[PDB]
Amino acid sequence: EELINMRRYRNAARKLIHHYSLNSTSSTEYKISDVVMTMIFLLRSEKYHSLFKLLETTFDDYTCRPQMTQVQTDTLLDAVRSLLEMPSTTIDLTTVDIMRSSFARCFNSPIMRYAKIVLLQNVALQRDKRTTLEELLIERGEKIQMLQPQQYINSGTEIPFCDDAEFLNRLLKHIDPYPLSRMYYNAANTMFYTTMENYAVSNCKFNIEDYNNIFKVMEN
Amino acid sequence: INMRRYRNAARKLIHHYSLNSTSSTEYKISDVVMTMIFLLRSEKYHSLFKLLETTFDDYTCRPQMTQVQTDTLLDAVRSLLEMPSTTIDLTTVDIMRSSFARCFNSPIMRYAKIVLLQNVALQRDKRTTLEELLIERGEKIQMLQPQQYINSGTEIPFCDDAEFLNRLLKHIDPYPLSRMYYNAANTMFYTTMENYAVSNCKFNIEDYNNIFKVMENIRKHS
């Protein structure tokens, strides 16, 4: 291309390309125009254009044959030499493969997206009034255990045999003569209230007789 | 030389940078390269191709097209988006060009640098402010009478047959839900920041942050 200042662009592209070599890494720096320029240049340079179109294999899982005549492979490597100084470390299929790997590690869909808002889904209920807590356990799957647990108090180990009179006996003076029965009644009320609510929230329903069995503690 | 595929990528890129970019993870450096190659192939579009390649921190002697040349350029643009229902102002395209300038000036790598900004490249050497919005003012509104008012189809209508409306609803049931929002509401009323095309007074995340604290009240107060 008239516009593309072929010599300048060639020089820049070569300097970029060298970064595949172990000694050169483009000083860990690049501008994406630097990469863009190279494909164009190769398209403008037929000696290379062949190799370039072949190196479309670099990013493309399906581009065409590897198998070319020995002479043809030299037809590629010689062009490589010409591009480079070719001072030593003679161009070889090893270099080819290293190049390909380097492109694979360079072109890896580096991001350029800018902005887009995000939503969430916050309703448990799906169509099953029947649900057992059992199958709800199957749902939960202890998936939460994927999440990191949190250290206990790390006090070590103790049993507080806290015999007392200084506080204790004055506490005893507040004998608190109240209908302990009816407070128990309220407690049980609220406890089944909790579980009933949570069932409703899950849309699970259950045999009350199981709760009756749960409570049925005392004998003799 | 899959010119076809390259074009196919290119059009997606065009929409992604211009408008209503509902797509996700559209970006791909190889794909934009294919775009540039397609441009080169597009002899007819060589004008635009050279304009686009020009994107660097110099940009003295902009294309300076004759209006005729600009019109032909827009013709190309519409013929290449193949969604010609509007001709966008050139300035949006130049803004996408500035984004491409950012792309060039980027030694940026595996790190997931989402651009995460509206580009400030719309400027005309002016400064703008929120209280200065009161100075942008509706003096013009005072200079204009409202066009008209009439009573026809007058007053207070009300709803039709519930059963017929359920009949209509059944056509609506199949459709997905909330993705409609995530397309339209999200994209559109984010990009409404385009209004800063008027000498780019800065956007302010803060009032947009209203949304959570305002909507929460529904659940917070049952």
Added chain:
Amino acid sequence: KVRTVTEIVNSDEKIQKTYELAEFDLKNLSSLESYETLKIKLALSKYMAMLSTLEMTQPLLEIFRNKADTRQIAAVVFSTLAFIHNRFHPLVTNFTNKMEFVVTETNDTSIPGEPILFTENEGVLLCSVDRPSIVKMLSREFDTEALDFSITEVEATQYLTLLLTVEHAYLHYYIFKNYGVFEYCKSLTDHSLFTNKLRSTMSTKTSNLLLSKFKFTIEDFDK
């Protein structure tokens, strides 16, 4: 309808009470995904029904396009506003004040965010709209959803999206009505005050924003 009984270590009889079935199904339905989806869809259906009653509302985006007739634009505005009025409260079904309305045709009127502008003087309440930008806003609605009556989802998209901004405007109008120019201006400087003012608003029914989140990356919220 249910009852409950409890007993103690002593033989001293028992405590008893009753509990009411209704609440539990009430709440599970109040969390029943399908129920709420039905609610929002019903709202949209009601709006579109009103559109059908409104002179058999014609194809939307072009009807808004083309500068053909201010009349239909103004009618759309008025009817939508009355619809929102009714939804938020049917108790006070309408509002009398007649007025003309302004269309504007220039970027030079651009108000960021706000497309629609309430104003008043001399008792003449008025509102104003810049069609062009709104036309653009509606136009191009790919709505990819990739991830007999011709009632496509597509234009229904816009039919919904309008409602959001119209609701946003309804907020400001309500604020001005209750408190007038000072509060109205001070607020439309910044929407942030709305909840802090409207804490009283235990309204019977709920806003559209059910999806409960509209957020993006923390970055650039810099001090």
Added chain:
Amino acid sequence: SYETLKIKLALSKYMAMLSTLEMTQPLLEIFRNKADTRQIAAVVFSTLAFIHNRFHPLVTNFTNKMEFVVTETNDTSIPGEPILFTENEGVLLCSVDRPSIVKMLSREFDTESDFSITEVEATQYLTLLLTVEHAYLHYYIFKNYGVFEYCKSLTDHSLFTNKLRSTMSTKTSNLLLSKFKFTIED
């Protein structure tokens, strides 16, 4: 009666344990706030140790190591099972719903130095302890019985019901829950 005497005695000793080493909260219920980490576990661990040593005084020091997760979501939620514990590989790990606990402990309640105490708020201790008792049932079950019947019982609570371990007494008489009876009405 002597029964009431011993009942309030055990109550008072529960207050004594509540006179905890740290007991640092200004609150009655840290759970009121999302922020806490350690005091939750402190309370829980302490109460568990107390219960176990009451069930038999034959324990020196309560096992030390443990680990915990806060749970505060409907996803986490398990109706009927506000609190959970397992010595997996012998290592105790445990979980408790902050909101589910609080939202009902705080519920409205019936009402028929000053150094003075209030019945309902005391009763909060009782109720929470009852939840701990329910947990401990399954805990002690699994302690000597395999995963199969353990997991089964987690639903068939009746499984342990109407089976003794040593005896119907089995020192359960020495546990306060024994003194209560209940039935759902028709």
